[PDB]
Amino acid sequence: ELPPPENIEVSVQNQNYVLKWDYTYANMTFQVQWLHAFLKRNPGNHLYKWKQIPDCENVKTTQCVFPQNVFQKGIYLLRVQASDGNNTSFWSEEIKFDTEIQ
């Protein structure tokens, strides 16, 4: 029952998305997950499953870089979690993101 990660932000760097968060407890690992935004209302009712960012399943820093072709042009949700190896943290706040940008 670890504390949840905080200050979740997305940015763009070259052909990559960069997801940054802040965590105060040292010696932690993180897992980054994503979801289609429309899944919270159309199926809703927990009739969906969160997915993992391809190479951010077990990151060691408070940062995650991943290619932009991980996503299509749409609206996605991102969330982060932490573990000590045994105990897992509550899930971060879900952030919404538009991959098109206009």
Q: In this complex, which beta carbon is closest to other proteins, that of residue 7 or of residue 58?
A: 58
- How near is the Cβ of 99 to other proteins at its closest, in Å? 9
- How near is the Cβ of 100 to other proteins at its closest, in Å? 9
**Number of other residues whose CB lies within 10 A of the CB of residue 37:** 16
- How near is the Cβ of 30 to other proteins at its closest, in Å? 15
Q: In this complex, which beta carbon is closest to other proteins, that of residue 51 or of residue 96?
A: 51
Q: In this complex, which beta carbon is closest to other proteins, that of residue 3 or of residue 67?
A: 67
Give the neighbor-by-neighbor strand order of the sheet with 95-98: 51-52, 29-36, 75-83, 95-98
Rounded CA gap, 36 and 88, in Å?
Answer: 24
- Summarize as ranges the residues that interact with other proteins (CB under 8 A): 36, 38-39, 42-43, 47-49, 51-55, 57, 67, 69-74, 76
Q: In this complex, which beta carbon is closest to other proteins, that of residue 48 or of residue 91?
A: 48
| CB proximity list for 56: less than 8 A, separation 6 or greater | 19, 30, 31, 32, 64, 66
Rounded CA gap, 70 and 1, in Å?
Answer: 30
